[PDB]
Write a protein that binds this DNA or RNA. Structure first.
Lengths: 51, 49, 52
DNA sequence: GCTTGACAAAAGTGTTAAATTGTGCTATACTGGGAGTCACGGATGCG
DNA sequence: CGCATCCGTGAAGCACAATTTAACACTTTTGTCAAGC
């Protein structure tokens, strides 16, 4: 999604079709990941770069 | 058009002048469009009678 | 071209009032608005040498 | 572990207008600039 | 060959053609949702 491994950001459907899921499924799992990672318990380590 | 490096046209000694056996002023006149110089001549019209 | 027009007008109009014309006076005769005149004056700028 | 469909915002196509950039042209006659020196070693030549 | 003397260097204004910007309608895609199967 963010292209961290290659540098090319990808749209939803473009990475939904590499697996066997729709674009909205990619959106749903992305929302899950954003909700889980955004929580302070993990963001406390990553925040200090530009807190 | 061709061009000659100034460091060798003059400098006491003038490397170009010594190389070609021309005085600095004579060489200066040729490089800088002030006098003509004969590049070569054919003997077939010098020793032909 | 327009830079020369501006320069000549600025040089000439001084005798009318005894001051170096400002953007208002210049615009009043160049038929252009002050902001464009300021842009022209900036555009007429020339680079200085580092070796000074 | 995830689909159908429906809406609105953002990413593209294309035509047109406006501005921005480059080359040419002007016919009385006029015809050649002007700017604030000495000291050093090396090439030439004299007997 | 032994050295002196001269020599050059350094220190006024527009017309028309072509190119380039950035307006806008429209199209497509991308992101988003409740409700749900």
């Amino acid at each position: 999604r963010f292209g961290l491994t290659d540098g090319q950001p990808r749209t939803l459907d473009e990475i939904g079709q590499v697996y066997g899921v729709t674009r909205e499924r990619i959106r749903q799992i992305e929302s899950k990941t954003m909700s889980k990672l955004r929580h302070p318990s993990r963001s406390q380590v990553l925040r200090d770069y530009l807190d | 058009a061709p061009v000659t490096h100034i460091w060798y046209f003059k400098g006491v000694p003038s490397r170009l002048g010594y190389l070609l056996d021309l005085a600095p002023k004579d060489l200066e006149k040729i490089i800088y469009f002030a006098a003509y110089v004969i590049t070569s001549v054919d003997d077939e019209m010098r020793h032909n009678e | 071209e327009v830079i020369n027009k501006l320069g000549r007008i600025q040089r000439e109009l001084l005798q009318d009032l005894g001051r170096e014309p400002t953007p208002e006076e210049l615009a009043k005769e160049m038929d252009i608005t002050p902001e464009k005149v300021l842009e022209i004056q900036q555009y007429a700028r020339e680079p200085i040498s580092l070796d000074q």
